[model samples]
Target: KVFGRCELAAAMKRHGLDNYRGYSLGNWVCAAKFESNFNTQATNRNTDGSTDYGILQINSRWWCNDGRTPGSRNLCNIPCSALLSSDITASVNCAKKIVSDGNGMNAWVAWRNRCKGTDVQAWIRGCRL
Candidate 1:
């Protein structure tokens, strides 16, 4: 894990994450919380054999290479393992790319189920960003 809730927001702000296409930093922050509990090193295998990696829970299906990762594209063009780190740059960049493909934050199911329409400022509250 790379951060607590506050630290995660600080890092995201420090990393210059904001609106990408139509998604906001709040969307990213909320997804991060729901997906990985702010842990950058988080990883989990899906029922289909694909895996989710990093704070955004990027799937091997399109963002990272974990065998096929088969999709219409390789948005992140990185190994799934690369996302499992304290460094979140790769994960953040790839997440932005996924949003750019008209997916918005809906690329992260957590965002839809847990973060959409919520007051995500709580994610950064009390954090010195």
Candidate 2:
């Protein structure tokens, strides 16, 4: 399912992402927009044969095990399929783990390219927290 902007904001806040790891809720919302355009089932196959799955686009090579990526760390200890689910709990949890691993929100290239150091307030401007 593709989430509307405010809908995504509400959901992320519900999952404790509002100020998670010093990253603002708008930061996460901005990254999610660029990464998957709010599509829960989005997937992108990298040149290295690793695929990024779901809304936050968690990669199989390090975050989740797809059983295809070589030497997958599965640091989140979750199946890649779980990231593709509309439930989003798995993806949100994995995103938190990724940020907690000293990567911060910079772990996602979309964040780096579009959200990092930006105001991002507009992403959730009208959404009530």
Best by TM-score: 2
Q: Please, what are the lDDT tens digits per residue for candidate 2 over residues 1-129?
A: 999999999999999988999888899899999999999999999999999999999999899999999977899999999998878899999999999988788899999999887889889999877
| TM-score for each model | 0.88, 0.96
> Which TM-score value belongs to model 1?
0.88
Question: lDDT tens string, model 1, 1-129?
Answer: 668777777677767776667556677788998899888888888877778989989888777787754552456888888888788888877876777777677878888999988997666667666
State each model's CA lDDT, in order: 0.78, 0.92
Ten residues in sequence with the least summed lDDT for candidate 1: 66-75
Clashing pairs in 2: none
Give residue 39's error in model 2 in angstroms: 0.3
Model 1 residue 34 CA deviation in Å? 0.5
Instruction: Provide the lDDT at 22 for model 2.
Output: 86
